[PDB]
Amino acid sequence: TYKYVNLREPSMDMKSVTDRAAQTLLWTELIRGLGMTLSYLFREPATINYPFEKGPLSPRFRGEHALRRYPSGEERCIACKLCEAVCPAQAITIEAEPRADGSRRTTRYDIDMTKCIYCGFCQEACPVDAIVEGPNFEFSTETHEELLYNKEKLLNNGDKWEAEIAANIQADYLYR
Amino acid sequence: XXXXXXXXXXXXXXXXXXXXXXXXXXXXXXXXXXXXXXXXXXXXXXXXXXXXXXCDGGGGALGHPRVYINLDKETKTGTCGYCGLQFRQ
Amino acid sequence: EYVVAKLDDLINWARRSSLWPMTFGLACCAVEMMHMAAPRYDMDRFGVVFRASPRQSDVMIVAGTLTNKMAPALRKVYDQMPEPRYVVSMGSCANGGGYYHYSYSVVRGCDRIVPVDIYVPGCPPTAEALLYGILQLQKKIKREKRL
Amino acid sequence: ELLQVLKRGLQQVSGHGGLRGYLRVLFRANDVRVGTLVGEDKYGNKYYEDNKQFFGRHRWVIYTTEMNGKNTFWDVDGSMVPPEWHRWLHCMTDDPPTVKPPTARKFIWTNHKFNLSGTPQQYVPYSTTRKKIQEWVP
Amino acid sequence: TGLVGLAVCETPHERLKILYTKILDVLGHIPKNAAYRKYTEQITNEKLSMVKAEPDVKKLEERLQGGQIEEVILQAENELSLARKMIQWKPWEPLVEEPPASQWKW
Amino acid sequence: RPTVRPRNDVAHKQLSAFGEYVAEILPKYVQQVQVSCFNELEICIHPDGVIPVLTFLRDHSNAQFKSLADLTAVDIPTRQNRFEIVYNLLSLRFNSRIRVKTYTDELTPIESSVPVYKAANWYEREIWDMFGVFFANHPDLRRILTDYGFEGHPFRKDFPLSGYVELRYDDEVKRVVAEPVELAQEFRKFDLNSPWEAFPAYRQPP
Amino acid sequence: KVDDAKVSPPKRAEMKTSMESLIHHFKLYTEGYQVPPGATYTAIEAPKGEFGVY
Amino acid sequence: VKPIFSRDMNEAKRRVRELYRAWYREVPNTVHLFQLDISVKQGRDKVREMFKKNAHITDPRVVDLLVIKGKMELEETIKVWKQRTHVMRFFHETEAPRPKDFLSKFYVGHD
């Protein structure tokens, strides 16, 4: 398409030479460059202090994993190994056994945070919508053991975020 | 229900004479609230009019694929694959 | 008796005030670590100073992926650090190999090279979540040297 | 023009508290600002909004004094504030106690919990399988 | 006027004519039965006729180049090196090398 | 078709002319097999002469390629001859992409592309690193992506993904970072391969 | 997405009701794509240079 | 012939001899310039045990590739390259190390 970066001799004779020499003799353009930051100082900065103010987000955002449940009790996860095979990090492990009598829903359910690159693939591959990614930021531990999620339990403890998840999924069915 | 000290959740054993469990001593171990699936049986069974009924959690919004359940035998009510909800007649 | 307990908190307040981290550009995480400088989410002169330097810095952030080539390289940096040193493993690669892991070259855990005090789980570790890592570090410093 | 800038600062200090109230928003809080407040949350959380200021900003909000058992006012992280993070805090437009109500299911926890941290009563890993059984008896 | 590349745009005509006449003789030293000589010669003769007909016109440079004479001169400069390497290492004239093992499908 | 087809074949017959033109020279030394599919051309080359093929396409009156830019290699243990070094070439004046392949097992040395192409030497180091193919008359053959204390070649399908030397402890020795420890976490081997043939015409008779 | 459900997974409202959609959802996940065999080279302009995927 | 490699049968043996001298002169030099580590005498014993595992010689093709590799992993010291007593260390420091016996290995129970 061509645009050209080269100026091809801005100075020609007398008048065009002197002003190109004036900027190199003293400064001028450095004083003009000084004025750029000068007005930039006066205008209000966009700063957010975290313990009081919070930054912008979205209805669909992936953070720490938490598995959802039905409104009338019952664990929504059905045990498929579907999310296990899609997982590109292989962070999720699943071994399933029959629950007492009749029902067949999970036994071993570990999601590694040492692994997991956060895709929302396990959210997408799930037909029952068990793992739904909630707006999470707060996670800090002393050990790997405290960081990697155990057999559901702490994932089921996502009830504190499941109220937000139920609100966020209402913006998810028939996507946006 | 709890055995000795640690409480069992979703069918889990604590320790055989305290050998495996040692990490959960200073820090308190996690436990899921009402993980015995008591809320599954707590829900009342709905009466059916047709021979086969379709199940749904709450339309397309809540994650539930549609499964038809047959009702032919009088003894033992039929339940869907996803829910613990039972149907009669 | 009362002066002994209160003076210990004053030394801990000095690290609660300011923490100088190491600028390791060894990751995609490092671009999110550059978002700590980006005005919208700032710990800059709230505690964090981007001057870094291998010797003067108190904190070192291990940003993301580490290979077996960088395993002896990052270890000698840790030895140059002063005695009050805190290591943040920001990113899933730093926690135990987010991706790769089972790969030949990538070192698993980072704790096999350098011990970690604060873990940040996020791949693209959002600057909102990154703000916790420094705030938790300041909160974790409670009591040092009783006798 | 010059007189209106100085008068605006005086109205902010007089509005929120006074002599002791303004010091709480200066020493404990990073930035002092006055506006409309909802004032309906679990524990001692206020959560204010409606202020213009800048794009992607929803007022001071303010951290709670003694949320569950921390008993701290000088230092507090984002462990506080009940289910409202996806509401008026960042994502949604409608306020949690004003327009959009939280759904009840009797499965969610009634009392909000703080971060696990290095303190006791924290996160832990656990075994799941009953393993291969082996027994010998006389 | 100067070209964008490092090669200096020098006003030189018939420079293209010398190099294109030189390469024709090199091709007629060792290969004769080979198709390499039989196909390359008719392209070069077609290009030489355009230079003789058009006197220093930009349209002559636009034919099969369109990046001035400086780019066309580079095409002639490496042509003598390519012809000498083809004459030294026998490949076009002789074909007797062994065939590959029977596998191709993935 | 509206959404099912990507592009209709129109330049396929035009690109097939190249499949004849280079083959009209007809060397057993060079040509062998010419494959053309999906607006692209593929040529495989006899091991004895690779440099004379690369001097061709460079300059040339009919087609001007010049850039012998990107350089790959294929590891496959099905054939009697193992490795397949694949050259990806691009033209700026002509605007076309042609491929140069090697068929030899190349555990025994192969001729280098350094005198023809300047950036080729950096890619040649990678092939010696990952695959273990030595280039004859090469200037500066140095390890890049491999470790300084690494055994074997990291890509070959003969050995596992984890390797032999991978885990690096610190523990007991004050300064020396460990190497001999070999254990890693279990990579779950997926056996997911669908029954029934995927596509017709691709089926080969036994 | 591509309307042909041998490449891209179908809609969430679609898969819950109709049959073929969920079976294709079950097989586009876990199992891959079932790709046609062949070697292909593509390069799309990166602001740094190229991504020559082979 | 095919394929060339570098040397033909007998010539390949003398290339190892030239490689042996270059590496024998570097092990006293890589104590003062590098680190003390273990010993100068023990470092020379590490050389002899390395060539014993490589000692087979059936074809010059295998021998020639070992020379190129030998002028790389043992070259990681001559032109001064960073290792910091972690790379180029061949001997196990933390090895158990296991033994091959039907009484020693079977007591620990492996495979």
Ligand SMILES: NC(=O)c1ccc[n+]([C@@H]2O[C@H](COP(=O)([O-])OP(=O)(O)OC[C@H]3O[C@@H](n4cnc5c(N)ncnc54)[C@H](OP(=O)(O)O)[C@@H]3O)[C@@H](O)[C@H]2O)c1
């Ligand atoms: N080379 C030698 O000196 C030598 C020669 C022959 C035998 N040994 C044997 O080898 C051992 C060497 O150990 P070491 O001297 O290296 O150990 P050390 O450096 O003294 O470390 C012991 C640690 O344990 C803690 N500790 C011990 N007793 C405590 C108490 N009553 N209350 C609170 N904290 C206590 C101390 O913490 P605080 O500092 O926080 O209290 C200290 O950090 C000795 O036990 C000795 O019998 C040594």
Ligand code: SF4
């Ligand atoms: S999370 Fe979803 S896809 Fe994974 S096992 Fe549970 S129900 Fe199946």
Ligand code: SF4
């Ligand atoms: S977000 Fe991705 S990496 Fe993490 S568990 Fe889900 S599929 Fe696996």
Ligand code: SF4
């Ligand atoms: S955790 Fe994610 S963002 Fe960080 S280095 Fe690893 S892949 Fe990159």
Ligand SMILES: [Zn+2]
């Ligand atoms: Zn149901």
